[PDB]
């Protein structure tokens, strides 16, 4: 009766789709009318970070929002400084291939990951001052896409195999292994309360996980190409999703549906990094056509163009307070907008 | 200057770090990076062993030139989402087994993979050093069975030289661009000694091409 089982599963999927249709009442664009449009957005360059000598793949901010972390093509993980233009550290990675970087919310540790299928965590506030490998987390099969720090002892990971794992820095073996996906997973973003997160796999589906229980909570379809980046809304009950279809999509947690589509005919190249600006009214998006965007998160109309790079933008993210934006493109430059 | 005493030392340390990265980039950018794609368990081990988890590198220097053979075929993931990391490699050592035409056939699967990796938009100027191994096994199997079983287009005779030429033309015709990149074939074998010499010759050719393009003389 396995055929009956799979057909019943398909019928249940049709039923949940019908429930989603019924749960729909209106559109976010329809709701947000009679509201003041954001208007033109002019965001000049405020800093440039001309330290790297190759491509730049990832970026993260500290809690104080003054120290950058940049994953390069040649392993040269740098901890920059924001207000001035210096280099607090320069970490020579073991494997040059690094596709993610994460700076711990406590300012102590920093992580990196790439094709080596190993996430290495570096310690900074060390007596006998020198950045050293605190732990080489291993256990993933495919490549590694994004790591994020819950605290100074736990870290989450989205790998190249169809899994996302919650690690343990003290004892290098995994605590939980989230597995509900099909195809590789490219990005993930933790909650502002560090209780839930979603990972965007290439199967055009995003899943809502739960760190404690370990079981998947919700699913999020509605796309046409593979997801490339996700960052929760500052509220903690929504998340945008990067795409290869050049279609940012703002999902939500209590309606489980898809709210808005930030798609225009002019844009055709894919998305690389999406980061909500603080207070949520701006949805940044690093495209492939050497150009970012300042998409108005409530009204579909774009607010402004943010383009000063000469090659593909590969990472971006707003400060903690919301004072600046740090783009890292495939060139050797990080640009601090404000 | 209105820079405090500690901030001045911070700037000095930042400049020292800048110098360190500049020196590292100078010493490492001249180094030669040879990506190795192809079909695993078909001669990769033999060719690697000839020259003395996930990705694995191999830093061997021959005739005073530091090489980096990057065996990435063991990644076992989506080949289109991590291949862009390998832009800027000076070569792509492909690997085909002449005996793997009698096992969707694996020979035509390897042909498809070769076509996909040659025509990829990330690798348009980077050369490809095609390899062909199992010479003795191919000789035995061409003495045993004909070449038409896997090749419907072929119509000649089951002679080793003609078949080898046919394979050369076939694998050097699947490239849609014959101007921006070259393909260096080589009928190596298991017990071989000249593969490192041939790879050195090909890498000298490609580095001469890169020098000509950089200087703008081309």
């Amino acid at each position, epitope marked *: 009766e396995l055929d009956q089982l799979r057909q019943e599963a398909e019928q249940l999927k049709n039923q949940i789709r019908d429930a989603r249709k019924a749960c729909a009442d209106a559109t976010l664009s329809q709701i947000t009318n009679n509201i003041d449009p954001v208007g033109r957005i002019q965001m000049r360059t405020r800093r440039t970070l001309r330290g790297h000598l190759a491509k730049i793949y990832a970026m993260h901010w500290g809690t104080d929002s003054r*120290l950058l972390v940049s994953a390069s093509q040649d392993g040269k993980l740098i901890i920059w400084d924001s207000y001035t233009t210096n280099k607090v550290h320069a970490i020579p990675l073991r494997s040059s291939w690094v596709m993610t970087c994460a700076y711990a919310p406590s300012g102590n540790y920093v992580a990196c990951g790439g094709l080596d299928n190993i996430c290495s965590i570096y310690n900074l*506030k060390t*007596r006998e001052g020198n950045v050293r490998v605190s732990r080489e987390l291993a256990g993933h099969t495919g490549y590694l896409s994004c790591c994020r720090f819950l605290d100074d002892n736990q870290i989450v990971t989205s790998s190249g195999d169809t899994t996302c794992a919650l690690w343990d820095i003290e004892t290098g073996q995994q605590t939980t292994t989230f597995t509900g996906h099909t195809g590789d997973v490219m990005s993930l973003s933790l909650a502002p309360d560090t209780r839930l997160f979603v990972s965007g796999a290439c199967d055009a589906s995003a899943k809502l996980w739960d760190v404690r229980e370990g079981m998947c909570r919700q699913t999020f379809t509605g796309h046409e190409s593979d997801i490339n980046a996700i960052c929760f809304f500052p509220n903690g009950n929504a998340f945008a999703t990067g795409s290869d279809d050049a279609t940012c999509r703002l999902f939500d947690l209590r309606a489980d549906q898809e709210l808005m589509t930030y798609s225009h005919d002019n844009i055709i190249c894919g998305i690389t990094s999406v980061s909500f600006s603080k207070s949520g009214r701006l949805l940044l998006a690093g495209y492939d056509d050497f150009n970012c965007n300042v998409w108005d998160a409530l009204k579909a109309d774009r607010a402004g163009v943010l383009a000063g790079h000469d090659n593909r933008v590969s990472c971006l993210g707003v400060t903690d307070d919301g004072m600046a934006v740090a783009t890292g493109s495939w060139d050797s430059f990080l640009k601090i907008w404000n | 200057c209105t820079l*405090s*005493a500690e901030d*001045k030392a911070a700037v*000095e340390r930042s400049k020292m770090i800048d110098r360190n990265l500049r020196e590292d980039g100078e010493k490492a950018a001249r180094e030669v990076k040879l990506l190795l794609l192809g079909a695993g368990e078909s001669g990769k081990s033999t060719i690697v062993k000839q020259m003395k988890t996930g990705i694995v590198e191999t830093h061997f220097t021959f005739k005073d030139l530091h090489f980096k053979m990057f065996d990435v075929g063991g990644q076992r993931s989506e080949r289109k989402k991590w291949i862009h990391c390998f832009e800027g490699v000076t070569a792509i050592i492909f690997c085909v087994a002449l005996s793997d035409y009698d096992l969707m056939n694996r020979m035509h699967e390897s042909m498809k993979l070769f076509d996909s990796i040659c025509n990829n938009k990330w690798f348009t100027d980077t050369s490809i050093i095609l390899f062909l191994n199992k010479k003795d096994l191919f000789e035995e199997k061409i003495k045993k069975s004909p070449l038409t079983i896997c090749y419907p287009e072929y119509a000649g005779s089951n002679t080793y030289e003609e078949a080898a030429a046919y394979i050369q033309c076939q694998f050097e015709d699947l490239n849609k661009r014959k101007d921006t990149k070259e393909i260096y074939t080589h009928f190596t074998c298991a017990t071989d000694t000249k593969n490192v010499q041939f790879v050195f010759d090909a890498v000298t050719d490609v580095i001469i091409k890169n020098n000509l393009k950089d200087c703008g003389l081309f």
Partner: single-chain antibody
Amino acid sequence: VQLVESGGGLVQPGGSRKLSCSASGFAFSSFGMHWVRQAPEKGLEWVAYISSGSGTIYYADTVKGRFTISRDDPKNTLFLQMTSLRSEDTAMYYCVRSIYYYGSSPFDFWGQGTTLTVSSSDIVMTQATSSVPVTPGESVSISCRSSKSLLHSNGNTYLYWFLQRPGQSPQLLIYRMSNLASGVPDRFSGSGSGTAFTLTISRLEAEDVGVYYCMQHLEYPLTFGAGTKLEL
């Protein structure tokens, strides 16, 4: 992780010596190093400075052109050669390590050091307290003073606090104003405003007694303070 300054004794005045401090267990290249001396019963005197790679060197007023300091990076030693020692430069010296980046903590570890005996526009810091009595358990505060406003335009105010137990090398406590050095209890808390600062002690134990030298780092030659002796 440890510094031992060696070389010294009783040389005749106007002689010449070269000191040494065999660094072993930290990034000697990456950490800038200083030299601080102590008279028989006076306060600490800043002497010299070497940065990472010897890119910038500073000297005190009384040693400019007389003393010379260099680092031997491969050998892990640091040298302070001396020319024309007067009869007023008798002191037992300290080999200081330091580091400078955003959020660093200079003067964190201070070597035990060796002695040296010879026969026969300054940022003022006046520590008015001197041999102040205190009962073990009660909360007291060490006063401080200055003349040039240390509240720089870049926010942080550069001024430090160095406790010294008797017969022991001094240690960093507060690597800026209102911070806390690693391995220093939360009982201590810098609390100041502008150009008059205090060092609160929540409840002193039987071990946190001695002199609390408060030193400014806004501009060289890093004038120290007179210190405040602590008692029972």
